[PDB]
Design an enzyme around this catalytic site. Sequence first.
Site, PDB file in Angstrom:
ATOM      1  N   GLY I  55       0.708  37.840 -19.896  1.00 40.68           N
ATOM      2  CA  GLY I  55      -0.272  37.332 -20.834  1.00 40.68           C
ATOM      3  C   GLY I  55       0.272  37.319 -22.250  1.00 40.68           C
ATOM      4  N   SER I  84       5.716  40.955 -17.210  1.00 43.42           N
ATOM      5  CA  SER I  84       5.569  40.683 -18.655  1.00 43.42           C
ATOM      6  C   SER I  84       4.744  41.785 -19.317  1.00 43.42           C
ATOM      7  CB  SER I  84       4.946  39.312 -18.766  1.00 43.42           C
ATOM      8  OG  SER I  84       4.314  38.999 -19.976  1.00 43.42           O
ATOM      9  N   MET I  85       3.526  41.469 -19.736  1.00 44.46           N
ATOM     10  CA  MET I  85       2.662  42.456 -20.425  1.00 44.46           C
ATOM     11  C   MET I  85       2.240  43.574 -19.459  1.00 44.46           C
ATOM     12  SD  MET I  85       2.367  43.287 -23.152  1.00 44.46           S
ATOM     13  CE  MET I  85       2.596  42.889 -24.881  1.00 44.46           C
ATOM     14  N   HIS I 109      10.739  40.337 -18.388  1.00 42.54           N
ATOM     15  CA  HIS I 109      11.508  39.177 -18.909  1.00 42.54           C
ATOM     16  C   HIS I 109      11.277  39.042 -20.414  1.00 42.54           C
ATOM     17  CE1 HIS I 109       7.603  37.662 -17.341  1.00 42.54           C
ATOM     18  NE2 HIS I 109       7.570  37.092 -18.525  1.00 42.54           N
ATOM     19  N   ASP I 158      13.988  36.263 -15.985  1.00 43.88           N
ATOM     20  CA  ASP I 158      13.123  37.031 -15.097  1.00 43.88           C
ATOM     21  C   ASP I 158      13.923  38.109 -14.378  1.00 43.88           C
ATOM     22  OD1 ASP I 158      10.875  35.685 -15.826  1.00 43.88           O
ATOM     23  OD2 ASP I 158      10.490  34.767 -13.870  1.00 43.88           O
TER      24      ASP I 158
HETATM   25  C1  BO2 Z   1       4.985  40.458 -22.667  1.00 48.44           C
HETATM   26  C2  BO2 Z   1       6.225  39.617 -22.908  1.00 48.44           C
HETATM   27  C3  BO2 Z   1       7.449  40.510 -23.028  1.00 48.44           C
HETATM   28  C4  BO2 Z   1       6.422  38.586 -21.802  1.00 48.44           C
HETATM   29  C5  BO2 Z   1       5.357  37.492 -21.686  1.00 48.44           C
HETATM   30  N1  BO2 Z   1       4.490  37.459 -22.855  1.00 48.44           N
HETATM   31  C6  BO2 Z   1       4.509  36.439 -23.704  1.00 48.44           C
HETATM   32  O1  BO2 Z   1       5.552  36.044 -24.204  1.00 48.44           O
HETATM   33  C7  BO2 Z   1       3.164  35.808 -24.055  1.00 48.44           C
HETATM   34  C8  BO2 Z   1       3.202  34.279 -24.003  1.00 48.44           C
HETATM   35  C9  BO2 Z   1       1.809  33.718 -24.087  1.00 48.44           C
HETATM   36  C10 BO2 Z   1       0.780  34.297 -23.365  1.00 48.44           C
HETATM   37  C11 BO2 Z   1      -0.511  33.810 -23.460  1.00 48.44           C
HETATM   38  C12 BO2 Z   1      -0.786  32.750 -24.288  1.00 48.44           C
HETATM   39  C13 BO2 Z   1       0.222  32.178 -25.026  1.00 48.44           C
HETATM   40  C14 BO2 Z   1       1.515  32.664 -24.933  1.00 48.44           C
HETATM   41  N2  BO2 Z   1       2.709  36.329 -25.330  1.00 48.44           N
HETATM   42  C15 BO2 Z   1       2.148  35.624 -26.309  1.00 48.44           C
HETATM   43  O2  BO2 Z   1       0.951  35.347 -26.350  1.00 48.44           O
HETATM   44  C16 BO2 Z   1       3.047  35.261 -27.452  1.00 48.44           C
HETATM   45  C17 BO2 Z   1       3.847  34.137 -27.393  1.00 48.44           C
HETATM   46  N3  BO2 Z   1       4.637  33.782 -28.409  1.00 48.44           N
HETATM   47  C18 BO2 Z   1       4.599  34.573 -29.478  1.00 48.44           C
HETATM   48  C19 BO2 Z   1       3.797  35.688 -29.540  1.00 48.44           C
HETATM   49  N4  BO2 Z   1       3.006  36.043 -28.533  1.00 48.44           N
HETATM   50  B1  BO2 Z   1       4.410  37.594 -20.369  1.00 48.44           B
HETATM   51  O3  BO2 Z   1       3.072  37.015 -20.642  1.00 48.44           O
HETATM   52  O4  BO2 Z   1       4.998  36.783 -19.274  1.00 48.44           O
END
Ligand code: BO2
Lengths: 180, 180, 180, 180, 178, 178, 178, 178, 178
Positions: I55, I84-85, I109, I158
């Site tokens: 997320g 991820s989160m 990842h 991943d």
């Molecule tokens: C937790 C990290 C290390 C890995 C991934 N998280 C993200 O990058 C997610 C991607 C996302 C999720 C929901 C809506 C929009 C974007 N986190 C973010 O919200 C995000 C994206 N870009 C910059 C800052 N935050 B996970 O969601 O796959």
Amino acid sequence: NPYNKLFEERIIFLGVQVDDASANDIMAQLLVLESLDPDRDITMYINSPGGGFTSLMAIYDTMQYVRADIQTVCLGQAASAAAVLLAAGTPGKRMALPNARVLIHQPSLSGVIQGQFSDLEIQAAEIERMRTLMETTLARHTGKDAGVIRKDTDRDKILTAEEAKDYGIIDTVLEYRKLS
Amino acid sequence: NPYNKLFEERIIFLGVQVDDASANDIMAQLLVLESLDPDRDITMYINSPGGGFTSLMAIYDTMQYVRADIQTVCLGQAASAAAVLLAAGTPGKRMALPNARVLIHQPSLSGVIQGQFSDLEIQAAEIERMRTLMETTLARHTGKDAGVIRKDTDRDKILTAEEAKDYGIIDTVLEYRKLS
Amino acid sequence: NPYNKLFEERIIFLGVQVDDASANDIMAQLLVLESLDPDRDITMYINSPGGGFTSLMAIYDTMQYVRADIQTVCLGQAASAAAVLLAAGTPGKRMALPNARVLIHQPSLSGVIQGQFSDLEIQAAEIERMRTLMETTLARHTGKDAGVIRKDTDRDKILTAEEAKDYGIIDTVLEYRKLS
Amino acid sequence: NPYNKLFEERIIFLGVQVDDASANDIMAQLLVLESLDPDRDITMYINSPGGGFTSLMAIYDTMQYVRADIQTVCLGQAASAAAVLLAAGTPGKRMALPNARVLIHQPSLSGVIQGQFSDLEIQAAEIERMRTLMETTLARHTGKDAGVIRKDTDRDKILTAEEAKDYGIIDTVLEYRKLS
Amino acid sequence: SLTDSVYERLLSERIIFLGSEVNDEIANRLCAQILLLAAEDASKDISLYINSPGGSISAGMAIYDTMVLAPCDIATYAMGMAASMGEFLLAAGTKGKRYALPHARILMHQPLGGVTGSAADIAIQAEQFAVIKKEMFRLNAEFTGQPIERIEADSDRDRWFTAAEALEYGFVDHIITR
Amino acid sequence: SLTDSVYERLLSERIIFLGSEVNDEIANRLCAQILLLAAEDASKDISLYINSPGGSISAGMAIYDTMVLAPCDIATYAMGMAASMGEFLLAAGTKGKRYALPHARILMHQPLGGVTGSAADIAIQAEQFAVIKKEMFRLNAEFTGQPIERIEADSDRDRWFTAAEALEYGFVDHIITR
Amino acid sequence: SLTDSVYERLLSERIIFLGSEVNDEIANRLCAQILLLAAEDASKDISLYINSPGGSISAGMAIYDTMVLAPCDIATYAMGMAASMGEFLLAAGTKGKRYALPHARILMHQPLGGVTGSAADIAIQAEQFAVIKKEMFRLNAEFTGQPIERIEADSDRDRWFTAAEALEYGFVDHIITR
Amino acid sequence: SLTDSVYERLLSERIIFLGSEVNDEIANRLCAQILLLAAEDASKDISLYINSPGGSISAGMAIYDTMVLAPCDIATYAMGMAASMGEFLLAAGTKGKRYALPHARILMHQPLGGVTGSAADIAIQAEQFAVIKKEMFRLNAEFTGQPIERIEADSDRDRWFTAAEALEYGFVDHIITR
Amino acid sequence: SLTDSVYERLLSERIIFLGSEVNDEIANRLCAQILLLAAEDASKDISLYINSPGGSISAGMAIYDTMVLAPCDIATYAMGMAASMGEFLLAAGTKGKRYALPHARILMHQPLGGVTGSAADIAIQAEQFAVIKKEMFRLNAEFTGQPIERIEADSDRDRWFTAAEALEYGFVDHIITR
Ligand SMILES: CC(C)C[C@H](NC(=O)[C@H](Cc1ccccc1)NC(=O)c1cnccn1)B(O)O
Ligand SMILES: CC(C)C[C@H](NC(=O)[C@H](Cc1ccccc1)NC(=O)c1cnccn1)B(O)O
Ligand SMILES: CC(C)C[C@H](NC(=O)[C@H](Cc1ccccc1)NC(=O)c1cnccn1)B(O)O
Ligand SMILES: CC(C)C[C@H](NC(=O)[C@H](Cc1ccccc1)NC(=O)c1cnccn1)B(O)O
Ligand SMILES: CC(C)C[C@H](NC(=O)[C@H](Cc1ccccc1)NC(=O)c1cnccn1)B(O)O
Ligand SMILES: CC(C)C[C@H](NC(=O)[C@H](Cc1ccccc1)NC(=O)c1cnccn1)B(O)O
Ligand SMILES: CC(C)C[C@H](NC(=O)[C@H](Cc1ccccc1)NC(=O)c1cnccn1)B(O)O
Ligand SMILES: CC(C)C[C@H](NC(=O)[C@H](Cc1ccccc1)NC(=O)c1cnccn1)B(O)O
Ligand SMILES: CC(C)C[C@H](NC(=O)[C@H](Cc1ccccc1)NC(=O)c1cnccn1)B(O)O
């Protein structure tokens, strides 16, 4: 192109849905063939599912208006407006191949037309005038009375080529003139 | 253009869905080839998934109507309406390459047709007349009885070229005439 | 136009999805080239993702039917219908450039086909007949046994040009004949 | 038309998305120019965002296959397949104007491809073969080792014209030859 | 729901609301509220505040019949907008107990609708629309005390009334003022 | 929900509502209400107010069977609109206890539907539609006391009735007036 | 919700409803109701009123297994419409306790579905559809007492039955009449 | 909600339901129900009736881990349909307490999924899908007592089982019959 | 709702669930649950079962800060999927109290996102994404005890872990086994 080649052979194809564009194409072809030779019979092959009543009356008026006789040969199906146009041909020269269909019913509105009740009353009187005009055309072209046309075209009256000849939509069933 | 070049070679292609537009194109080509030479055999190559029954009967009526014989050669698949048109060729000159398909079943309505129960009864009697006319055409063209056609086309009766020749849809299987 | 210029050079392009329209275009081109010169080899360049099985069998039947030999040269990819059409060429003259793909698997239905269980059983027997016919064609054209084709085309069997030559889909890998 | 006028001047435009249709157009143009004069250098102007890998390999195979040398001049962007095709030109005659882009990365699937895990494993092995074939092509055309191409095209490796010349995608940067 | 909560709390105080387009569902809700209030007390007034952009005649016919056949005197209140079936149900209230808020806008026009089907079906719909329009105009003449010819000539198109204009025409009997 | 609340409060008073298009879900809700009211008291009347634009015959057949098989006498009330299955279920009430509100509009017409599938499937649907139409017309003749031929000739297309016209035809037995 | 309220009130009286298309969700709801009624009292009848346009066999198989394994005797009631899985679950009731309301329409036809995937996948789906059809036809022969060949010849396409026709065939055992 | 009401009433009787596609939300609901039933009584059986068309493995992995680590012995019941993750969670029950209703249909096929992204991403997804398939097949071999090679050869495509066929294979231990 | 009911019943037992994609709404729900459990008892463990497909980072940052600042020791439980989160919030638990169920799948990842706007806006988003990635990788190095360079080299794409693989890497501290 086969359409132009048969147009030089005095053959018109009523082969698509009868809307205003196809109506104007058929009228332009009929007027060209009338200006070319007003005595030679214009052959109109009719394989159409019909369409609007105004385009129907336009094609009927242009077929009766041209100096050339209109030999309407129905192929496959002449439903709604194409059956009235098939009966609109020259008497004695209205043909249909034996497995063709003739669908005659009262004109209907394509969908829902909204508006005030006075406008709906006007549209209802107009479609009643359309029904009466179609019944009068079929009565003057098939030899029957307008009341018989009114009961018959109350619902979908579907006839074969023989049944349309007994009904009066066509004057002759065309045999298969294959040499073999 | 290869289509026009084979049209000068007396070859017609029933290669698209059999609707009213394709029906009128095929009828115009057949009438042009009949007006050109009414003795030379019109070759109709059939690779089509079929379509409406009225366009089917229009093409059948025009094929039987032209003075030229119709050598219908099925390629790939003559399904629904194209199988009846394949059987509609001249007897003794109905061909199909060995891996072609012949799908014969009763005619169906494309979707749902709404209306009052009297209009639905009329449409049901009309599609029953369509089924009976298709069975009569296949009985008169394949040599079988209309009841055998009725049980066979009750569902999707799918045949190969050999199976269609034993069934009577074609009169000859065309061998591969490659020189090597 | 380059397509017409290579058509005068006896070169056909199987470059789009193999549906009934592309099948009829390819068949018309093949029949024109056969009527022009039945001894000169028809070159068919194949870069296609395939399509229906009936169009596949139509193109295969027309390629085997024409008196001219069919040199099928696969470029890029011959998936599904294309790979069987690539193997359908004249033995000894089936080519593919070294980085071309050959995807052979059992025929599938594009989406979901609904109906009663008897109609579903008929469609299942028909697609089983399609699988058996494709396996028989690949066995007669690649020299292998139909059972090996059945296990290999059970899933997506993807081969290069060399792998298709060892498999038998092509008879020669075409080297880069650049002068430099 | 300017495209046909430059086609008489031996100039081909790789200017659209590299799909099977554009691939077959480029292959037809290359084969026509090869049949016309197999010694004169075929100029291919490349401004394309790329596309499928199979069309990429088809255009690469046809460029290496024709007897004429391929002078690939990249304008704007030679991205994905268009870059590999830019490196696929004749060595010593690969050009790019100074502000052109060269985007090299591993091939990807356009969207999601569903199926059973065995089919997904087959598709994964196939895209790994695509990655290895692209790396081998870039190693044989740019003079580098396939491992350096593997680390560089692991993600989007974006280079200018000079950076592509130091990388080996092109052999010369084309100066602005304006007389003023 | 807060809106349903305050609606039921005002229903306990015999205050119902025609606050949306008069379709069959809202009409059956209003008739159920009227029947419940008549079963609770048949001698106390039912206050129907109408803020409606119109709707179905049948729905309006159902609401009107439930209003008249309930032993309670239905006091209608033109609240902001009474268009079409809103004004028809507002004027349908008990004589001497039909009110308009001083800035409500009341829209009386000929019934609207649609024709479809074959020519006989559209002719039957024409007879039905004529009977519907004659019944609605006769009922509006009964409510406002105006002649039916003036009703039909005025409701031939969109006819607008303020509070004082509707008081002069006869849709309401008093203008609530403080 | 306020609408469900007043519906349950009138269900406690044995007043049910056919206030939408008669589909299978609303039909099963109405049959469940009828079965509950019959299990509570089998000697008290069940008041069914019908404001419906029609719907499914099967749904109407289920509601009708639940109406006649419940020991209570189902008093139907034509409220605004009774079209097709609404008028069929309105006339399905107990004789002498079928009522129409004085401005309800009642629409009786031949059952409608669609044909699909192969020719044998459409022929089977034709037999089924003929049996359905004959059963509905025989039941309407049983309700209204009219001959079945007059029922079929009148319901060939859309046939409209007011309160007095439906009282004369036989869908209802009294016109509620105050 | 009023519908859920009357459904739970009739569930307290051991009356469940198959009032929609038989999908997996409604099937699990019905099996949960059956298991609850069997845990409350395993000697009292469970009344299942079926007004269904068909649905899923796996769903119908789940409902059927929950009906049989339930210690209680499942009295099924054909209410208006019993098509495909509705008639299969109606005839699945206890012998001597399967009823049809006098105007219910019962539709028995071969199971329907779809074929997708590769040729081996469609062949596997063909074996599964053949086994499913044979099991459904053997179970319908067990219910109605008819031979399995007559079941398959009749359910080759849409086969319609009235109340008396289904009583003669064997889907139900009595016709409820007052 | 009636469905949630009967679900909570059967949860009080330690009967949970896997009645839809096994996604992460329904999986967390089922794991929460299992954890609640284990916190209430860790010695009484948890009955999991499975009517599922499959779903996510991760979701199935969560449900499976919650089933095993739960002190209670999870008695699974194949109810109508157990496909993919339904059969995996059905065979995941306690040995000697896995049951199939006599007409349930059990589908065991290789896990399905999707590849996307660059070539390295799809290669990583390939390693993950291979590990997932090997883990699922080893777990199914642990459940059914069959060799892992037979599991992989049978679940290469859609593999169907009846009640007796799944009893012979090893997904369940008894066939509930009355 | 049954799911909300069992969720609140396990919240009373200090068991919270991260059972969906970590967006801002679910994150604020989880932080509210954590704050409530810390206000009830600040000395008892909060069990967070994580079945999440990832997320938002901001959302994960909020959940993480609420986890660390709450005086209770947040025991995280990898349940099926931690991607991820999920994995980030699973490894964010108290050291010695981070657990993985024996078949959970943990996906670490690089943060993913999107760039938009003008070139200066995309450059600012690049600085922010670099800071976000460095912070997430430093925090994962703090959790797992691994070097930050190994974290960045492994989470470049991943990176998948089983229960034992995540125990060896450092996301969890024990593998729950019975
Ligand atoms: C937790 C990290 C290390 C890995 C991934 N998280 C993200 O990058 C997610 C991607 C996302 C999720 C929901 C809506 C929009 C974007 N986190 C973010 O919200 C995000 C994206 N870009 C910059 C800052 N935050 B996970 O969601 O796959
Ligand atoms: C029955 C004979 C007279 C002609 C019939 N015509 C109509 O019913 C057509 C419907 C139609 C169909 C297709 C496209 C456009 C319009 N009716 C009209 O054009 C029409 C127009 N204004 C008022 C009433 N009817 B045919 O389409 O059934
Ligand atoms: C079976 C033979 C005789 C011809 C079949 N034709 C029909 O079923 C066609 C429908 C169709 C089917 C497929 C594609 C397009 C249209 N039948 C009709 O056109 C039709 C028209 N009016 C009443 C009943 N059927 B074929 O298309 O299956
Ligand atoms: C495998 C070889 C024999 C040919 C394959 N053909 C089919 O699977 C095609 C389906 C298709 C695929 C792609 C695009 C359009 C249609 N097969 C059929 O046309 C077909 C038709 N009826 C029954 C079963 N299959 B190819 O498309 O994979
Ligand atoms: C990277 C180089 C080698 C070529 C790239 N192409 C691909 O990745 C293409 C996908 C694509 C991309 C953009 C538009 C249309 C199709 N690769 C494929 O066609 C492909 C096909 N099957 C398996 C795996 N990849 B380019 O488009 O980035
Ligand atoms: C005072 C009334 C008559 C004025 C207007 N009412 C109508 O005429 C309404 C407008 C409407 C609303 C919903 C759906 C269709 C049509 N007309 C009808 O309900 C109507 C139309 N045709 C036949 C029977 N009733 B109002 O809704 O603007
Ligand atoms: C009361 C009867 C006689 C008159 C009308 N009946 C119908 O037209 C209804 C309209 C309808 C509703 C839902 C789905 C399909 C069709 N007909 C049916 O229910 C119907 C249609 N075909 C077969 C069996 N029943 B009414 O229900 O609108
Ligand atoms: C009683 C039986 C024999 C008659 C009818 N059966 C079917 O046609 C149903 C229709 C349906 C419903 C939902 C999803 C897919 C298909 N068939 C099935 O449920 C079905 C279809 N294929 C495989 C397994 N089950 B009914 O359930 O519609
Ligand atoms: C239980 C196994 C052996 C069989 C079936 N597995 C799958 O096909 C499921 C289907 C599915 C469901 C939701 C979202 C995506 C995919 N596969 C997965 O869940 C899946 C796919 N790729 C990676 C990890 N898990 B079942 O779960 O449908």
